[PDB]
Design a protein around this nucleic acid. Sequence first.
RNA 1: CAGUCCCUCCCGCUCGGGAGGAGGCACUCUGGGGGGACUGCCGGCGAUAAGCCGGAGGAAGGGGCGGGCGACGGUAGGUCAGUAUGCCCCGAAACCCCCGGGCUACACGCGCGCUACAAUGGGCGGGACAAUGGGACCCGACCUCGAAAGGGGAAGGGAAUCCCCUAAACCCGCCCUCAGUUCGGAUCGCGGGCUGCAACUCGCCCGCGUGAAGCUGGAAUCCCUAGUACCCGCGUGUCAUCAUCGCGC
Lengths: 135, 102, 215, 144, 71, 148, 67
Amino acid sequence: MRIIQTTGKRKTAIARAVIREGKGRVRINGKPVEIIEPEIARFTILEPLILAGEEIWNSVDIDVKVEGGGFMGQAEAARMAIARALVEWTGDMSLKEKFMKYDRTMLVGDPRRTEPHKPNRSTKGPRAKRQKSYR
Amino acid sequence: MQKARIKIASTNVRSLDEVANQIKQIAERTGVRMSGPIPLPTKRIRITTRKSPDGEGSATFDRWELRVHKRLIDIEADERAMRQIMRIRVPEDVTIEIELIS
Amino acid sequence: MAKPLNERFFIPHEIKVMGRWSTEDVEVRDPSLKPYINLEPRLLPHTHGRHAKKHFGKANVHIVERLINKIMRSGGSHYKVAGHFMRREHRSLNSKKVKAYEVVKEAFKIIEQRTGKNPIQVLVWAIENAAPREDTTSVMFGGIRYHVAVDISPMRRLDVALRNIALGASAKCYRNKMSFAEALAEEIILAANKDPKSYAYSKKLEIERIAESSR
Amino acid sequence: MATVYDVPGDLLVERVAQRLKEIPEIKPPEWAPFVKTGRHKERLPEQEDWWYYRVASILRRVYLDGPVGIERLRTYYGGRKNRGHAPEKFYKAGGSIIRKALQQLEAAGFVEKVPGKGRVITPKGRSFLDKIATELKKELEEII
Amino acid sequence: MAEDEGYPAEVIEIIGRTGTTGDVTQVKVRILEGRDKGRVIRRNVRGPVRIGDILILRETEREAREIKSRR
Amino acid sequence: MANFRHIVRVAGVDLDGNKQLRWALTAIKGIGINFATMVCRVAGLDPFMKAGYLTDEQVKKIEEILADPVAHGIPRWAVNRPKDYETGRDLHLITAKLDMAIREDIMRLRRIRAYRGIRHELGLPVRGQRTRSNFRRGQTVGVSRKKK
Amino acid sequence: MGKIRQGFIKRVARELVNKYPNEFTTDFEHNKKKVQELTNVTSKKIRNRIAGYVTKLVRMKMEGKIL
RNA sequence: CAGUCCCUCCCGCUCGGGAGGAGGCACUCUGGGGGGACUGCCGGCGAUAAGCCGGAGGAAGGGGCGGGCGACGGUAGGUCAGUAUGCCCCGAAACCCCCGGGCUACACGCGCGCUACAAUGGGCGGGACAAUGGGACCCGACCUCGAAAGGGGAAGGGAAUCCCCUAAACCCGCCCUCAGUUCGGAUCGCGGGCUGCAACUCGCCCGCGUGAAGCUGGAAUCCCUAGUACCCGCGUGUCAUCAUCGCGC
């Protein structure tokens, strides 16, 4: 068989993702994909899988562990890592370019992430000044 | 023999690296079997401060940083063997803690 | 509910929006709106898109993501959590696009229940109509004050359209049985008709009308 | 061919709750839903479902973790109590429902206290859950 | 609705900005519609617009303009 | 069902609604939202069903339960006032007891010449702190207890 | 908002091609290596700029007007 | 349960799903060091220069991005009530010790914030998720008693190795069905816990009862430009305790 070990990371949700041949396993953090209460963010993961097509999907076992604090953010990290896992697998330009055309959140992370909370002038929020009325 | 843990932690980046590298290099050839120097953290201490004693105006506020960075060594040797390696100069301000167990 | 929802998982995959609405069902007949809209692309509006990056990176925003965001807008200092908790998440998200998304989805469900058509075909239709063609900007140039004829660009048209639709929903949405998912949903239909009941379409006419005078 | 892992909680919980009624070794004691409630409640619901769901999730928790506290099960719940215009702060459930719930299971033989100082599943507790999960997981596939 | 008649015109060139607001930008247009065809007009357009875009002109007979300029 | 009426009388001749049973008791002074459900358990009725879907029979139960909550059950912190004026073990409060019991303890305090007793009379929060520029713009707290 | 290359960055590159023209190239990387050997590396980021401007200065030299 | 000859548990449609321990440092990560981005290439505008736009490749671009970084000086700006310090003044006092009170008084007026006027909703229940940090008369596993607040007993930890710790927003199913209410939580009665010699003045929290104004706000006016704003909770300092604060995630 084969072990290929890939990562995706979106907004510091970090996906440790393995693809091996098998039977159609979808595992996230130990549990089936099914557990997730949200429908919506499940439909984000499913998008690289359908675009390659279900044939490959059935033929391989993808286990991921997506260790990110967002529920959207997990969906996000898992979608980038699946897209990359799929492209390493078959190895063709066909699947890579197809992905680039559809969206670039499937195979690029972000160039930034966060900004600190600036010191401020005794007021909350990193880009904020104390209200005035002194005129 | 006794397995001895040298834990070495320091405030600056410069000093801790010289010690770890030299400990491993002195230790390498002799009765010693040594496990490679391992970095443990900077627990990075923030101390977040107000500048101005006034409290008044805009304030521009201080982000501080004290970094203390930890490297952890196992060595297998006698107690006599440990002192020999310990001989080194060491950067002022380098804490060296020793654990001795069989 | 849960099984239907699972089926709602089977169907979007195949490829539909929100689990059961084919994107192919609709086309933009008018060529103006065609690059201006995102009817042709994909499935979930949650996209984190980072649009507004470049010049016109806001045009590769899924129509529905623009709607969720525009829709989100209203929100002041105050805190929300599962607890005793808020409002703070508004009539219109004194909050989360995450939650914001649900309304759009329920609104999508409701509009489908009545009209029975693909609700993107209704919302897309409504955005085309809601946008006023002409506007007057008090434009003085050179110091001389004119109350002039100005032609609306298409990006500006969509933006006016969606903002106006959202704006109207909140107004009725005020302490009244419409549920913004309902209020929006009822608005999206009528905005689509150019009906006399659409606070959005009233300004669409009136802005053009006053503009026509002023030009 | 299933585990509590496999099964969306929403379906699982009603199923494990009904099994709790059936078997029928675990039961509501009267004092607990009366007024010896978790934190504050707008209304306090007169349901068998209440008590059973509470215990249903302790069986799931005890499986997943190793040592799981009373303190741990109390905090885990989520829920908040008013402090006025000063914003709400987190606070934690009742100790009451939990200690007795852990105990009613203990007699059932489903939980046991390890010598380690903690709590862990028996074979009997673990068994009851996977059988139910297999039933649920088998049902899930049949339905569109 | 009724059409009116929509006169489609595309923008040949973006001359510069007008309004003290700034809010119109003035752009030169060429027409592509059944009636006239080809007519060049300098219309006042608002909002983000690029070169080669399409504008529906409500009134063909227009062309207000004011002009200058870059050194 | 259990025999519609849109108005039933409960807790004396005070009226009982068609809002919901739990909520119609909350209106009746001295029986609040939470206390209502406790009595409901004892009486044996559905808590979530509409008020006024009660025969005459149901009505009798709730009244004896009101009179000495403590005989039937009802914990000694869950009951309305427990340890009453230093020599009552527990009591109940309703509309006539509740009025009286707070008005007596206030009356006592004027006479003793407490700070507490005078602070209410003036119209002021005792242990709320500020009175400095709260109740702004001619507004009032209204102190105790009702202006509806 | 704006971009303009400092003046210090310009001075080093100009002197460098004048001393050793024929030991400089149209490859960024080749000039960067040479620049590193020539003058002190206060930092990495300035090393790259000097090298870059050198690449341009050679292209310009071809033309026959190099300012 | 990366990859696994092994091993103990459960489950099974025997195909197959999951956890422990061997074992294995792959991976995530830690911190130390190195590359990469410079208009280098390509086209347009421009004096063929300087620069500006645009394009390809690429993880990223044309101050990439976010802080620290702020001249000579002025407002006789702000602090002699943090310290330093010229001068003047006080000397049973403008000193010194002590208890108690006062800073927390209110008919009002304003600034700065928090919570808020409900169905984009509550209750109930389940289930998936983080990070900065802080932790020795300190954080406190877990166990037990108590409704709880908290108490009794006790493991580990001076720290990638334990603890606070639960993320909250999220979603699903169920009950509820738009009122000044099941909104909102002021006010007041009573029971009780906690620190401290002591919380009436003047602490917070639990539980029952009470249950106010407010149902979207004139004139006028403030902030901010993107992973920000809007929105949600989490920690920290100080520190027993008053946080609807300040700093930070």
